[PDB]
Amino acid sequence: IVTIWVYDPESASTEELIWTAKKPSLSSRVLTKQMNTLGQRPFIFTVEK
Amino acid sequence: NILYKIPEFIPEAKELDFLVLLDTVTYTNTPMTPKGLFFNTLNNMLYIWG
């Protein structure tokens, strides 16, 4: 099970830059819901098949 | 239901054009005077002006 959100490397927390986070920060949460309103959804695509 | 609390003072933006109004910002000293609001129902846009 993978959990995905959107984050901005300039206005992110310290954990999200070294890949040790579990819960989105305030900037990442607000940006994620703002991009969700505009109609953005991620999907995972396997390469070999 | 309450939707927003308009801040008393306008924020500061030295070189920025858009500012996503979070809970951690810096305010100036000039007061903020809201005069009206406008809703666009074709694209679901809200504007507050003053």
Main attributes of the structure:
part of a larger assembly, 2 chains, A: 49 residues, mainly alpha, 2 helices, B: 50 residues, mainly beta, two-stranded antiparallel ribbon, 36% strand, globular, Cation channel sperm-associated auxiliary subunit epsilon (chain A), Cation channel sperm-associated auxiliary subunit gamma 2 (chain B), protein transport, sperm
Strand-helix topology:
The structure is cut from a larger assembly and holds chains A (49 residues) and B (50 residues).
Chain A: H1 15-18, H2 26-37
Chain B: E1 9-11, E2 27-31, E3 36-40, E4 45-49
Antiparallel strand pairs in B: 1-2, 3-4
Descriptive notes:
The structure is cut from a larger assembly and holds chains A (49 residues) and B (50 residues). Chain A is built from 2 helices and no strands. Chain A has helices at 15-18, 26-37. The longest helix of chain A has 12 residues, at 26-37. Chain A starts with 14 loop residues before the first helix and ends in a 12-residue tail after the last helix. The relative contact order of chain A is 0.21. Chain B is an all-beta fold. Chain B contains no helices and 4 strands. The radius of gyration of chain B is 13 Å and the shape is globular. The relative contact order of chain B is 0.26. The PDB classes it as protein transport. Keywords: hyperactivation, calcium channel, protein transport. The atomic coordinates of the mouse CatSper dimer.
